[PDB]
Amino acid sequence: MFTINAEVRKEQGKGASRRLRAANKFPAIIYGGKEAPLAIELDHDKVMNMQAKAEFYSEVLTIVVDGKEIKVKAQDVQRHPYKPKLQHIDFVRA
Amino acid sequence: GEQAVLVHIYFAQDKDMEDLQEFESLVSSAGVEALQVITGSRKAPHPKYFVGEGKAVEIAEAVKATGASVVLFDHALSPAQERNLERLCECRVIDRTGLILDIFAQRARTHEGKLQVELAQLRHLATRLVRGWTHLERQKGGIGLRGPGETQLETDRRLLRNRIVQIQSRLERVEKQREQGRQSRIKADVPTVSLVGYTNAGKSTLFNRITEARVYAADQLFATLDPTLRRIDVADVGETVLADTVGFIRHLPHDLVAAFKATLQETRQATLLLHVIDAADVRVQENIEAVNTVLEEIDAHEIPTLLVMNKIDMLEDFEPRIDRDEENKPNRVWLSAQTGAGIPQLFQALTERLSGEVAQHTLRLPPQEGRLRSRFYQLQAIEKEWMEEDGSVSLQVRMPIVDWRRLCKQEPALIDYLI
Amino acid sequence: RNGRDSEAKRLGVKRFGGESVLAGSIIVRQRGTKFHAGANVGCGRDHTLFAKADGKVKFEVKGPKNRKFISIEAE
Amino acid sequence: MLQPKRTKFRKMHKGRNRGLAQGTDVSFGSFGLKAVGRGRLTARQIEAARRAMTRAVKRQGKIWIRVFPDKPITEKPLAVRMGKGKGNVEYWVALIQPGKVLYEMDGVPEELAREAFKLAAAKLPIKTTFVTKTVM
RNA sequence: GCCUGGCGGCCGUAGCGCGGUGGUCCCACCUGACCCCAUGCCGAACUCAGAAGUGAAACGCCGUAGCGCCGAUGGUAGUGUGGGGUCUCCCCAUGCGAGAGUAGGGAACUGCCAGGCA
RNA sequence: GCUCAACGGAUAAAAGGUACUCCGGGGAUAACAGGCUGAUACCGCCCAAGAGUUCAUAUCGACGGCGGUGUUUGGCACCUCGAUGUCGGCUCAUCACAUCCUGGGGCUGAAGUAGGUCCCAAGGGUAUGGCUGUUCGCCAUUUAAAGUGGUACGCGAGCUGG
RNA sequence: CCUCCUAAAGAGUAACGGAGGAGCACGAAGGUUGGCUAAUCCUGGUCGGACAUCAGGAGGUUAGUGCAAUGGCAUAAGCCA
RNA sequence: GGUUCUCCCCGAAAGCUAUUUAGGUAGCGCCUCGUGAAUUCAUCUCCGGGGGUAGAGCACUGUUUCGGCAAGGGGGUCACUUACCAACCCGAUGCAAACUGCGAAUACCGGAGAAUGUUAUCACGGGAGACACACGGCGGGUGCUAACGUCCGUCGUGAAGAGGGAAACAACCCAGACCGCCAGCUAAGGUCCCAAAGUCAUGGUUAAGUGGGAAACGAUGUGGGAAGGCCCAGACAGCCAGGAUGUUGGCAAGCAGCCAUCAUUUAAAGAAAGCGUAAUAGCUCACUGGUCGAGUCGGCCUGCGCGGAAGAU
Ligand SMILES: Nc1nc2c(ncn2[C@@H]2O[C@H](COP(=O)(O)OP(=O)(O)NP(=O)(O)O)[C@@H](O)[C@H]2O)c(=O)[nH]1
Ligand SMILES: [Mg+2]
């Protein structure tokens, strides 16, 4: 049911990630299987309200990147130490 | 809560002797672990150590052998005697008054109790300013030369006196607060009874049983600090205030008694004192003497008193009863705490104790006496209730004269039975 | 009670990987054999490692225990 | 009042309290009190907050204390000069960084948990926030 | 080509466990002990003269992710230089960028010599 | 042949008092007062277990928390050692307000008189003696009140010298 | 005088900073040749107890080092002749 | 303490070691003049190295919390057992300057290569001065992550450095004065007047003179963002109506306290929210509907504001 819409990261690193989080996106990674890992950026408020639901961390999610639907599972979440925010999500293909 | 060598001396010649068992009780209540209890006998105190040179060397040897941390005398000893004992044995020395002040310091949980205990400690320490060891040495000078202008001993005396005055001033503030709390009741025609006596007299548990209100009680000496007041029912005058109080011990420090002036205001102005006495204590006469001595010290011995002998259950084959003076006024009562024996007789004696009316009226009216129900049941009660022929209702009532007068003013008073 | 210390011993690697050494030059001063000796390197009585031949210093890790060895490669 | 039973040494250096907290998730119970600020938490403060919240929940549920004060803090007495050796140990503190979950709580409704944690946070010297258990 | 022995390279992706398998040669145990040699007692070990037996144990090989081991990408922490703040601590630009953890890998690879069987 | 151990070791061989004091220096360095700080002190607030005849917040307020002043004790050694006279008293004062009295007001466990507490308010007022060198303090007797602090702990080129 | 830390990953680095030691010992406790491998626990066993020696097992240095601490030590630098 | 004419070039240190030494002095470090010897030296790139710091982690050394599987002791039976306690091990969770199965950035050592630099490197000789340092930044010990405090490391400035800025203000920011000019461009910092330059352009916020001093904490101030409940089955605050049966539940009536805390007819009612009553009666909250026709309710994240906020000419 969960359909996230994400872009492919032009630049990756500390500075780029913090610029994303100041612009209210945040980075994430898709790995697993045998295709190469894909580094993407997501919309923070949308994914936060999405992961408020408990079944987010159990169902098969879909992510739309460059018009391609990739089916994934949420593997790890990195959260801000004291704010209700997200730093990074790891998605495993399945 | 450290290791101590305990010291007691049998001053049998004069009344300056103290009880070793009570002393050990105070020490254990303080929490100190006793490694040895030394005894001596003397005629009058030795000025240099408070004990002989031989006994001082024995206490030094005992400290050296046992590795003790403190030495607890059961007696008041001067700062010079403390200094000389300290010089002989490196361990610290605690007076009986110091032990009592330490016990109260540990026990104090309220703001008032902390204030009083720190005032007592400040006065006790102001007594012990004999050594002015400081690193600034004597300030030399002459006429027209710079300097502090005064000695360090005088400066320290100034500072101690100033801070003592500060603690005192906050204490009269606390007295004003408690006096407002008192004055809430005095404008009312309040009866107030304060139960007081030697420690471990069972008076706190007597309060708990009478008032059905939980207050701390145990086998710990000086268990209670600060008073607690509770409403109680008495047959004659109705509502009365029972007050628990901090207990006494033989030879309370005078600085402590002065510090507790704010707390003792309840006993000062009590309409009755219930002097609760442990009958099972073999030193019962000494307890009477000590309690009367402190009452005289605070100048509260002219108040009406009534003795209450608790712990009759420890007396074999005894039943409670009330001993009465030649004027037919109950001056002594006996009772028990846990078994509850003697409690109703204590209530009856309390009814008899304070009152100024014995007349009983009988009232009756046509159907206009629901207001009479309300007013009677409002002031006190209906003493004897019944009806009679033709719908008439014949009450019998006995309430105080002030209640009579206020009821007469409020009502039309066409009953022509109540004044 | 705690105003004491010993003169510092100036221990450590005195001559680093790849530098040229004459015979007899101390490579590393050490308490215990933190570096062991390999080719053309001698161990002293206080565990000093010195060059036994003119060459260039080389560091390596050898053996089952992954121990560090000092060797001198003849230039 | 918490304290280590024993220690290798009696006096630690002052150090610094930089960085972000580890152990930033509610692990044992369902609810937790998390530190938003930074600073020390003394054993007296920890005891005060624990007593307040345990009174707020009248002997019900279960309470975990995640922070333990294991750092000795020395203070020199008054009328003493500088130097002449390091001061004597007077109390123990727990260094708190942002994100550190301090207390944890289970077996209670969320309203009672919030009330108890307000009463506790009224005793601590650092800003805190309410947190709830999360999956992954 | 297959198997064994000796000596190396590398030093856990190489180990420890579990299951199976091998005696032609080799190896192992094994047979005996005046002597060569030895037990702070013991032919257990060291050692000598051998070859009836069995691969039981050991050893080698093969299979198994039980444990060990290895281990990205992305993010995070930290930090050099320059600048800023609300300056006990942080943030911005730029360069370097962990540890832990996840996905996954992993039942080593190889050189000289000798013997047996093809 | 060295506890030359004060361990780069004055000599083989060596302790104290000075208020009867002296001389060269140093504000490189203490005491006074000033400065920085503000642990301590004083005041203020946050939470509310509890006390308060029932009743957390009339009046208080434990366990703990946060500030303010610069005011006590301290910390530092910044100024002054080619001199910045110290405590108390007398004379003369001046500001602050965290108000002692008098004014205005909210609450009150304010029936009335009399109070308590908080808020506004600095115009004016704001003891005399015994004891002691005293400041303080105790006491006697007063008053509407006998405020708390700053001013080199105001004030010796104004007095005194306990 | 020696060990560690402060000490900021070469050296070095102060305070009346935090903690401990030395002012020796040994003709074997030195040299060399040959040989060997610990602590602890589990189980069974005469006197035997939680802990004396023996037998096997797990374990792999949690032992040892003449004396503090640090760093080392299985080729052993540990033990025996 | 004082030490007398001029100009030109270079130009410190306030550290280590030792000392009856500590405000003295000596060697070295630093200055300077001279002589001599090589890419000698610095910077950057690449290459070869060793770290054990920051961070991290918890195998080790210690410390810590909870749970699990459970020896062993002890209050009692006079070997059972256990509301106390409970080591080992297992799982999760943290902490360490004197912990490390990990581990940077920098710095340091060495080699090679350009370019650049008044040889800036090394040695020797003549002459010194100096060995009270101060503050600022970063990393620390100590102190209270107190001090214009003290003690180290490292860089900068002052010392020994003028000019511009910070009102004034050695050590902070910009910036290194050979001399003259009534010429121009910029740095920090500024551009309404004192006072040189925008009463400049565009879009927002604030109403507090906030700006131009301050905290926990308190608050329908005001702007913005993402969701949520409800509403044309009519919502929210407004406007009418009912709160009773056992029962005065029991140990005082719902309303001192304590225990049951469940039904009920029913549109609905907690054995009752405070007031109040001696206490009932009473008061009416929770509790439910009618009428009323466009939005309403309250949590989260954030910009800027408010109170908390009292000193002496
Ligand atoms: N045997 C017996 N023990 C009694 C009796 N009354 C009281 N006690 C016990 O004596 C002790 C009394 O303590 P407490 O009630 O605090 O009396 P208290 O005098 O008010 N204590 P304090 O004055 O020191 O604060 C308790 O141990 C109580 O058990 C009695 O009648 N008989
Ligand atoms: Mg009592």
PDB file of C-alpha atoms and ligand atoms in Angstrom, chain B residues 204 224 244-245, ligand 2:
ATOM      1  CA  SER B 204       2.332   8.913  69.417  1.00  0.00           C
ATOM      2  CA  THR B 224       8.682  12.193  66.263  1.00  0.00           C
ATOM      3  CA  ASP B 244       1.153  15.162  69.366  1.00  0.00           C
ATOM      4  CA  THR B 245       4.494  16.588  70.493  1.00  0.00           C
TER       5      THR B 245
HETATM    6 MG    MG I   2       6.080  10.774  68.938  1.00  0.00          MG
END
